[PDB]
Design a protein around this ligand. Structure first.
Ligand SMILES: NC(=O)C1=CN([C@@H]2O[C@H](COP(=O)(O)OP(=O)(O)OC[C@H]3O[C@@H](n4cnc5c(N)ncnc54)[C@H](OP(=O)(O)O)[C@@H]3O)[C@@H](O)[C@H]2O)C=CC1
Ligand SMILES: [Zn+2]
Lengths: 146, 125, 134, 290, 114, 94, 85, 206
């Protein structure tokens, strides 16, 4: 039901700040020239990027490639994952390695610091299904959510 | 009398399609998903081939949806994905094939509704 | 501000919590002057004299394969190994647990409906929030 | 940009170019090409006309349904001008006449009317204004036609400072009064092709650097009027008109190196040799260029 | 890989028919420009003929080449016999079509198409 | 229920009106915006609620086979009236 | 100089066996020596093993590791870690 | 039963017997013979058999199919040979109709049947025009229905309904011109098929 947000508060034109400090519609040519001018004038740690939650991989690599070309490696995300130890070197460090369908084969599930009902509703539904049909035993460490 | 021909079948030069609608299109080969609003499975029997969606814009006069994509409505039907791939190959379209998704067989038991000691017992009928 | 495309307006690759790569398809084109997000960056790279080496969706997806090959294996779940090596490195540096209890950001249904920019702009989601609080 | 005028489509008849143009003088030689190019890419064209609607009929097929709108107007009535321009994003003034009538002198057509259109357009908030003057416009000309062009060109610049002013040489084309003029019969001429001028006008609308500038539109070659007329007769396979027109025809085409031209708008001038047959085929050795 | 031929049994046989068609088209352009009173030059017409032939230079299937020749001869017959009108001959030249953008940046500015 | 926008254009019963900066209103210059003045939402509201004695009433819109498909309306709720989904007539159990 | 290491390999193909041996035996010690260097290990079924090195300003080279032994893998790692291309 | 079309077993039996008769006499070419529940006999043949089979049916004393009612094609993209060539014949002597079907692809010529039926002349031109099937030894094979210089074969299932180009008069060049098709209102595709099987008798094995 959230799709109706796609019809509201949309960004439809390039915008740059005018002489008075307000965002004003402009052409693609003008908007990118202003961005390209600043990009050419900076290098290394002076350029950084943050990716939001809804960004696609094609854009993620394109931005990483573009910032790498000015020797910037500060490609960040908003969601934190500890970089201590292996960090992101090993996929298994940050994956749901059992897979969603693998919950139906588990016999005990330990949930730590999560409310999967709202974080991953269809994953929680898979837990309940195993709870209902496989007699799965579930334990939680965290707030006693429903 | 027959002749030998080893070249891959290619008809892009004799189909009359403009170059733009051969090289820049992306054909999708798939079995349509069941419409979740209905239980009937008869629209999931055959393979389909559709093309990438392009721009539709509002007609200034009436507000109708205008298009410049001649392939916007084209949808072909195929017995198998091999037939669809063969058709895409000889027409020069690049394509993606998605494997058919079949519902996995379930274990159903009415008696489980009244289990003596399991959670499958239903609280209402 | 550079207007990009929403997930319904582009064919883009997303990887779910299991590492399974999947791709959206274009349902409608982006509104107004908005553009496909990777194309914006590719266009910016050229104007900046640093043209990126890909010009089509298929070419930028060839690039993804060079960085992480699993990112183009659509619908496939590629296994990941070496938990033993990760646990060794995890023990190298000691860090203390804070005394704070583990408290998830979403404790009730009211916290569920608005979490991103799309659902925050949704009038239906606002009606849901209002209904479950009032 | 208002959402209604964001470009959409592939530049065809059913597309939305985002241009809303009021073209004064659209029922003449130049206007029919300008309207055609605007309507080709799906622009909204407002056509104020003084003539009978029967005389505007050739403009109707030039746009998709609803894209050509016709209005009554009077050159001396500023209210009729305001109705025509108050919804437009660009105003193109192609009003002109090669002779004077009982009711309109060169001063009316080339000074009072352009000034009125420019002033109302400025009041109504029109962003762009394109005014056609003449290459040989000169306060010190024998032609009262060219004298009035110079006075009007000055007035438009004062009234609408951001106006794009275009100064073409004599224009040749199917409906011209130039090649057709000779065929129906010391000085150097640099005639320019009708389609080149049209492309220049259309590109001056899109080009944001064109605002405030004055352009001279000339063909690629300069000819002696004697060489031209001889060539015209040869192409027409023929054995080789006010007094003001004669003065104009005998005015050497000015060489204004300081003004930008067709090349500055991305248009390549068409040689007279390629298109001369097109104009003159119905009246049935290239001329030496300087 | 054993198929029925159309006219030619191999590429050398097919390439002969292509050359014969090219000569026929080459010699017809001057009369076409005169009969249809076209404003293009004879060189333009022949340059257009060559361009049409050259975009098919990569074909190596004799059956496909045979059909291209078959279709090319139908087009020639339509022209020599003045079944075509002037509009049909000039459709090869796309005079009213404005030049579409080819480079990435130009395409990016105008729309969404690849 | 026709009202005029600040610029003078009549608003339709679907709420349509060209805004101040829309060029498209040039189409009405020298002509007119066709607007139907009999707003159905206003006209149906004037119809009186019909008082009935049963829990369930039926409506076919009037005129027998010239009306709409016959539907049955439950009138158990006392807070509100029963409304026909086809013609908008209202009913209330006395 | 060096900015990022990536190692691609298959989980089961014999051609990636040497890379698999290197990871299980030598990666942990490699990571300790280069604590602040991204070494992205990415397994994918049926891919030929590869070693990608990225240097400053987005220059990349890739060395094939197919059928390499764990020792050759070590050697290739040392070559990249001493370069500044 | 008032609403049900009555069966005609006598005609079904006669047509079946003649179908076997034809199959016995031209085994070299006949691949399949079937009679429909509304009593229409179809002979499916290898494409090499077009001239021998049609000649036999026209001239043989127990056939005498002297009239070619229709000749047409059907495009079925899922088939390796996508074009089905259908001959509908009529025998005035025996007051009977028969249908002969063969197949071809985009690059395989079919022998022209003009020698057997002069009526085939324009039908084959129409098939070439609308489907692109080439008929060999036709006296005059060329487009018949489409505009001069028209590219493609519109009746193929993959040819778009509105085509690729459209025409208008252009004032600048003073002639009708062709340009890529843009539609003010796109044709609205409807998905009408019910997800529930209608006809069990035609269910395909899974
Ligand atoms: N053609 C040339 O060789 C050159 C022309 N120019 C200028 O370019 C512009 C157009 O050229 P061209 O197209 O040849 O001009 P035309 O004379 O061919 O058409 C002139 C237009 O102005 C309109 N017009 C004339 N007088 C009046 C009036 N008194 N009140 C209202 N409308 C009027 C006419 O409408 P109606 O049909 O109703 O009279 C017609 O649409 C003119 O300004 C001309 O001076 C400049 C350089 C060269
Ligand atoms: Zn009712």
């Amino acid at each position: 039901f959230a799709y109706d947000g796609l019809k509201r508060q949309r960004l439809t034109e390039p915008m740059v700040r005018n002489e008075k400090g307000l965002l004003t519609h402009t052409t693609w040519e003008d908007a990118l020239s202003r961005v390209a001018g600043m990009l050419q004038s900076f290098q290394g740690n002076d350029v950084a990027a943050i990716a939001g939650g809804l960004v696609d991989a094609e854009a993620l690599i394109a931005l990483k490639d573009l910032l790498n070309r000015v020797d910037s490696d500060t490609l960040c995300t908003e969601e934190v994952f500890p970089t201590a130890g292996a960090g992101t070197d090993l996929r298994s460090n940050y994956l749901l390695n059992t897979t969603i369908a693998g919950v139906e084969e588990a016999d005990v599930v330990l949930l730590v610091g999560t409310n999967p009902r709202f974080e991953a509703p269809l994953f929680n539904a898979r837990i309940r299904k195993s709870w209902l049909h496989n007699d799965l035993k579930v334990a939680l460490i965290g707030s006693p959510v429903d | 009398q027959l002749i030998t021909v080893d070249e891959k079948l290619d008809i892009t030069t004799i189909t009359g399609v403009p170059e733009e609608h051969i090289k820049t299109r992306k054909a999708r080969i798939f079995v349509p998903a069941r419409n979740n609003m209905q239980s009937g499975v008869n629209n999931t029997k055959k393979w389909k081939m559709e093309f990438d969606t392009r721009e539709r814009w509002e007609n200034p006069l009436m507000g109708w949806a205008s298009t410049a994509d001649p392939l916007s409505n084209l949808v072909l039907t195929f017995s198998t994905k091999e037939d669809a791939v063969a058709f895409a190959e000889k027409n020069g379209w690049s394509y993606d094939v998605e494997e058919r998704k079949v519902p996995k067989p379930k274990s159903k038991s009415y008696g489980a509704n009244f289990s003596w000691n399991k959670r499958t017992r239903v609280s209402t009928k | 501000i550079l207007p990009g495309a929403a997930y319904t307006e582009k064919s883009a690759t997303y990887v779910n919590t299991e590492g399974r790569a999947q791709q959206t398809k274009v349902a409608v084109t982006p509104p107004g002057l908005a553009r496909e997000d990777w194309k914006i960056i590719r266009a910016l790279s050229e104007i900046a004299g640093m043209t990126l080496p890909y010009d089509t969706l298929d070419q930028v997806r060839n690039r993804l394969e060079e960085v992480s090959p699993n990112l183009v294996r659509y619908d496939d779940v590629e296994g990941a190994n070496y938990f033993q090596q990760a646990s060794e490195l995890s023990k190298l540096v000691n860090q203390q647990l804070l005394a704070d209890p583990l408290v998830p950001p979403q404790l009730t249904i009211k916290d569920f409906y608005m979490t991103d920019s799309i659902s925050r702009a949704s009038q239906t989601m606002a009606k849901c929030v209002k209904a479950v609080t009032e | 940009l208002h959402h209604a005028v964001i470009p959409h489509g592939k530049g065809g008849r059913s597309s939305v170019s985002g241009i809303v143009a009021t073209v004064f003088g659209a029922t003449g030689f130049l206007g029919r090409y300008v309207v055609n190019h605007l309507g080709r890419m799906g622009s909204q064209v407002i056509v104020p006309h003084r003539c009978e609607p029967y005389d505007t009929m050739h403009l109707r097929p030039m746009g998709d349904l609803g894209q050509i709108i016709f209005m009554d107007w009077n050159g001396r009535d500023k209210d009729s001008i305001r109705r025509a321009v108050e919804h437009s994003s660009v105003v193109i003034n192609l009003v002109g006449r090669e002779w004077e009538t009982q009711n309109f002198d060169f001063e009316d057509v080339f000074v009072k009317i352009p000034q009125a259109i420019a002033q109302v357009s400025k009041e109504a908030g029109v962003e762009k204004f394109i005014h056609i003057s003449h290459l040989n416009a000169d306060i010190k000309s024998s032609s009262k036609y060219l004298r009035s062009k110079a006075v009007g060109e000055k007035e438009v610049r004062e009234t609408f400072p951001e106006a794009t002013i275009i100064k073409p040489a004599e224009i040749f084309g199917r409906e011209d009064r130039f090649l057709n003029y000779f065929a129906n019969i010391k000085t150097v001429k640099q005639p320019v092709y009708i389609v080149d001028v049209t492309k220049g006008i259309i590109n001056a609308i899109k080009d944001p650097d064109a605002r405030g500038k004055t352009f001279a539109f000339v063909g690629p070659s300069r000819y002696l009027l004697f060489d031209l007329v001889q060539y015209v007769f040869a192409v027409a396979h023929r054995p080789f008109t006010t007094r003001d027109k004669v003065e104009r025809i005998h005015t050497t085409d000015k060489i204004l190196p300081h003004l930008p031209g067709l090349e500055d708008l991305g248009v390549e001038a068409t040689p007279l040799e390629l298109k001369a047959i097109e104009v003159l085929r119905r009246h049935r050795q290239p001329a030496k260029t300087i | 890989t054993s198929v029925k031929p159309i006219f030619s049994r191999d590429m050398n046989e097919a390439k002969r028919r292509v050359r014969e068609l090219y000569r026929a088209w080459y010699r017809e352009v001057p009369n076409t420009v005169h009969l249809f009173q076209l404003d293009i030059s004879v060189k333009q017409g022949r340059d257009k003929v060559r361009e049409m032939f050259k975009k098919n230079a990569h074909i190596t299937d004799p059956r496909v080449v045979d059909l291209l020749v078959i279709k090319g001869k139908m087009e020639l017959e339509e022209t020599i016999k003045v079944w075509k009108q002037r509009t049909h001959v000039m459709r090869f030249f796309h005079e009213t079509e404005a030049p579409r953008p080819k480079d990435f940046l130009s395409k990016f500015y105008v729309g969404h198409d690849p | 229920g026709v009202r005029t926008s600040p610029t003078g254009e009549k608003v339709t019963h679907t709420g349509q009106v060209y805004d101040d900066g829309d060029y498209r209103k040039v189409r009405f210059v020298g002509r007119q915006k066709e607007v139907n003045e009999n707003f159905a939402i206003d006209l149906i509201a004037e119809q009186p609620v019909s008082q009935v004695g049963s829990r369930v009433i039926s409506c076919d819109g009037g005129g027998g086979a010239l009306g709409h498909p016959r539907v049955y309306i439950n009138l158990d709720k006392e807070t509100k009236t029963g409304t026909c989904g086809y013609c908008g007539l209202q009913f209330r159990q006395q | 100089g060096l900015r990022e290491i990536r190692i691609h390999l298959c989980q089961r193909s014999p051609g990636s066996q040497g890379v698999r041996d290197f990871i299980e035996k030598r990666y942990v010690e490699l990571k300790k020596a280069n604590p602040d260097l991204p070494i992205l290990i990415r397994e994918c079924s049926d891919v030929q093993p590869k070693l990608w090195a990225r240097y400053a300003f987005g220059q990349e080279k890739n060395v094939s590791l197919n059928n390499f032994s764990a020792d050759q893998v070590t050697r290739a790692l040392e070559n990249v870690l001493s370069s500044k291309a | 039963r008032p609403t049900v079309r009555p069966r005609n077993d006598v005609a079904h039996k006669q047509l079946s017997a003649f179908g076997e008769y034809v199959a016995e006499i031209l085994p070299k070419y006949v691949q399949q013979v079937q009679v429909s529940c509304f009593n229409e006999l179809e002979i499916c043949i290898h494409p090499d058999g077009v001239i021998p089979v049609l000649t036999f049916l026209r001239d043989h004393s127990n056939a005498q199919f002297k009239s070619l009612a229709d000749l047409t094609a059907v495009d079925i993209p899922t088939r390796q040979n996508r074009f089905e060539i259908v001959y509908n014949l009529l025998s005035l002597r025996f007051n009977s109709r028969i249908r002969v079907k063969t197949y071809t692809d985009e690059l395989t010529p079919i022998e022209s049947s003009v020698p057997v039926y002069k009526a085939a002349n324009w039908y084959e031109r129409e098939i070439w025009d609308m489907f692109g099937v080439f008929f060999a030894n036709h006296p005059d094979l060329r487009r018949i229905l489409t505009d001069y210089g028209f590219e493609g074969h519109p009746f193929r299932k993959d040819f778009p309904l509105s085509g690729y180009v459209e025409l208008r008069y252009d004032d600048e060049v003073k002639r009708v011109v062709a340009e890529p098709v843009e539609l003010a209102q796109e044709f609205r595709k409807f998905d009408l098929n019910s997800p529930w099987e209608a006809f069990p008798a035609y269910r395909q094995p899974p």
